[PDB]
Amino acid sequence: SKMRDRLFFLLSKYGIRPRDSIGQHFLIIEDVIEKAIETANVNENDVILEVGPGLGFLTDELAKRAKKVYTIEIDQKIIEILKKEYSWNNVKIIQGAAVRVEWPKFNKVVSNIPYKISSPFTFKLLKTDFERAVVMYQLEFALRMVAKPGSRNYSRLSLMAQALGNVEIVMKIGKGAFYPRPKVDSALVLIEPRKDKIVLNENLVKALFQHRRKTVPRALKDSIHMLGVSKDEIRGIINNVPHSNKRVFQLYPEEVKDIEEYLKKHGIIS
Template identity: 65%
Template sequence: MRDRLFSFIYKYNLRPNRNLGQNFLIVPDIIERNVERAELSERDTVLEIGPGLGVLTDELSRRAGKVYAIEADNRMIEILRKEYSWPNVELIEGDAVKVDWPEFNKMVSNLPYQISSPVTFKLLRRDFERAVLIYQLEFAERMIARPGDKNYSRLSLMVQAKASVELVERIGRGAFWPRPKVDSAVVLIQPKPKEERIELNENLVKALFQHRRSTVSSALRKSAHMLGTDKRSIKSYLPSLPHAEKRVFQLSPEEVLDIEVYLRGNGFFHEGRKREKPSPPAR
């Protein structure tokens, strides 16, 4: 597996494109463990983001019924088409953040780190059964952070509102070529049952976590413009606001939902809301 990867690198005189986050995983054991974690069978359709030189793709093709691999680098697409003859792999050239994803039920990927956030949020909007993804370690730690932890963030809350996440393995820099500047981690993502998933207003979450160390009432005043209003207008909602004196980074998804339900029930959110202009000064 490792020898094949380097033979391709030398054969095609490849220089990894850092703008595309190309760091190739070269440790076969990690690839095998991730394929095992995905619990694949011939009934599964797998989505892979960033197949690179096809080392992981090759293993996925042996276990799954169908594999879709989205690759932004046309050099890699050409090499994959020349070097492999997978009967059940479909290559899709394009930016994984922008292209339409095909239907799948599992995802297994060594993600380009610069698209980790948009790919994760895009994944959480889909119906799927299981995802086994490699992230930058710091990003993975934020994904699994609990309310009140120093790493707890908008990412933590939005992911945990819809899925169970577990950091299952840390990976050193030497497991990749070229070596990245940071350590990595494998994260297992499993969607919560539909009745347990919490759909949150993303604008509200962004407004709150813009000031994650502030109290909820203070954060909403400071971020009123992000919600299409101003400090004076939002102030009237604060006296009875749930969890108003709690720090934002201590809020669970359920508590953010409490805040949203209260604001919505009192007419704060409505379609087409625009920023309210302050009244002109009296003459």
């Protein structure tokens, strides 16, 4: 309520509307912010990466707890409002689409991931030096991140989220803690990066996961006529591929790597 007239006061003070994009809903509750920070263990030493600061509500609490905070927004007026309404020594505003701009060093992330970029973002993040990330996706996206191989909703994301990270869903987050109210719930996600990251070939993984319901022969066979490669040059080679029996939505990162070393050896990916 206090943080919510405090949302409206800025919206009216600056003449901006509920939603610029239909993929943006500000977090507007303090102990979700506090619990996001407490989950991250932000200390005086840390260097933070928020995405989409909105009206500075979560940036405030990060800024008063850490050494340094980098924070990205793409709307030039939002920046103007984070600069006028706040008096930070340590916060560093960056203008851009956070998927395209080059990121700083940071040991941690504490963010509310706008949904329009939940998947580009997460991919970039999982391939970075960070000891901890505490991100707020939607409940569906968060569940896709933690889906188990074989299970219906296993995707390119769930694989690389398993290959390269550990993923608590810390708690569900009521649609009530945002404005405008979202149609659906959100979730809080912890991401420590994996000790033994299983490093995979990207072009392979997309190819396999372009049609993830296909068996890995069919998935490999259909992809490479597309590349420009003759099917005749490749009939024999693929047909001794490991786990040719699996469909792609049933693959462990351990099993994609086996396919990697095989195609590379037998001379396809390289």
